[PDB]
Amino acid sequence: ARKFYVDQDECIACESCVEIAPGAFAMDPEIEKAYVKDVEGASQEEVEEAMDTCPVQCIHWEDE
Numbered sequence: 001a002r003k004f005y006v007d008q009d010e011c012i013a014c015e016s017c018v019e020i021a022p023g024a025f026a027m028d029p030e031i032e033k034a035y036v037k038d039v040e041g042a043s044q045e046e047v048e049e050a051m052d053t054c055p056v057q058c059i060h061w062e063d064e
């Protein structure tokens, strides 16, 4: 079991990840920034490539 999430707080003005995860990553009006709105929204291989993108990443996994 391996989960994850992101620090939309460090999210800039790009959607590179959202493109590699148009279901888990998605900016919000409350966070005015992309965030793992649903770890099941994207797959780990999509969440992976989406992790490579991003300037400082600001994304990480969530064991257990």
Ligand code: SF4
Pocket: 006, 008, 010, 011, 012, 013, 014, 015, 016, 017, 018, 025, 033, 034, 035, 050, 053, 054, 055, 057, 058
């Ligand atoms: S790739 Fe990084 S900077 Fe671009 S929206 Fe996703 S979280 Fe934000």
